[PDB]
Design a protein around this ligand. Structure first.
Ligand SMILES: Nc1ncnc2c1ncn2[C@@H]1O[C@H](CSCC[C@H](N)C(=O)O)[C@@H](O)[C@H]1O
Length: 261
């Protein structure tokens, strides 16, 4: 049943080195060697806390998601999406939330452009806190699993979360870990019916995830766009040139922002 599931099993059948080779075959990457060595030293200016900033940049530079006003970042991790939104013109406030703790990503304090508008807190489980007013809602939650039914449940769980934070006309960028399972496809169709947007594949995503993002300023038939990605991921199982094309990492500048009137 379904292309994505067929893709999933071939993926699970892949050897430990076949998997790694496949994971990056023909994908788009961000050159992060030097930014990570800077962060390690302790630099807090210019650098991105993770490859997630570049990730979000791809969507924003194409108006698929136009962050503005108060931005809530569910599952901010180190703060990749949050610090990036902190430098955008129309952004007034950014609030990031994560689980944190031993063996989980924790926010890293930075001084990138507009950091003073960024509040990052860990020790928080977004699934059980009351929804807050939000102009733009970001969510990058979704732990992958060898079992597609497990991911299907994790995905429905975040889709039900973001729904209660979604008011009408809120800008959003929500990760949909497993968009191919039949039960997630159904929910996404409902969600889109009530809230526009569409699922879009980020070229920076690795081939090892069927990861798609529900973005507000986009359109397209759900089933149609998901199968399009399933075929793409299956095609990449057998590639002659599998070199990943790199791009310089994002520069988040430095300094406080003075929004004023
Ligand atoms: N219920 C929950 N509440 C809060 N954070 C959660 C959560 N479930 C998962 N997470 C967190 O969400 C994070 C998603 S990884 C995303 C990182 C971010 N987009 C980057 O660019 O900076 C994980 O680090 C994980 O610890």
């Amino acid at each position: 049943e379904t292309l994505g599931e067929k893709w999933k099993s071939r993926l699970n059948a892949l050897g430990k080195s076949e998997f790694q080779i496949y994971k990056k075959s023909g994908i788009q990457e961000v050159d992060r060697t030097l930014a990570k060595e800077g962060i390690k030293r302790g630099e807090t200016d210019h650098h991105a806390v993770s490859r997630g900033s570049a990730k979000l940049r791809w969507f924003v530079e194409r108006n698929l998601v136009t962050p503005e006003g108060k931005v809530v970042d569910l599952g901010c991790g180190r703060g990749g999406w949050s610090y990036y939104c902190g430098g955008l013109k129309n952004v007034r406030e950014v609030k990031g939330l994560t689980k944190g703790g031993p063996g989980h990503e924790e926010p890293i304090p930075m001084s990138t452009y507009g950091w003073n508008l960024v509040r990052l807190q860990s020790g928080v489980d977004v699934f059980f806190i009351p929804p807050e007013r939000c102009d733009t809602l970001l969510c990058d939650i979704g732990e992958s699993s060898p079992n597609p039914t497990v991911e299907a449940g994790r995905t429905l769980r975040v889709l039900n979360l973001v729904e209660n934070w979604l008011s009408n006309n809120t800008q959003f960028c929500v990760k949909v870990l497993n968009p191919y399972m039949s039960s997630v496809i159904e929910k996404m169709e409902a969600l889109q019916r009530k809230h526009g947007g569409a699922l879009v594949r980020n070229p920076l995503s690795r081939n090892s995830t069927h990861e798609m993002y529900w973005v507000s300023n986009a359109s397209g038939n759900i089933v149609s766009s998901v199968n399009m990605i399933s075929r793409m991921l299956i095609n990449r199982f057998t590639m002659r040139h599998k070199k990943a094309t790199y791009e310089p990492d994002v520069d988040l500048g430095s300094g406080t922002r003075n929004i004023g009137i």
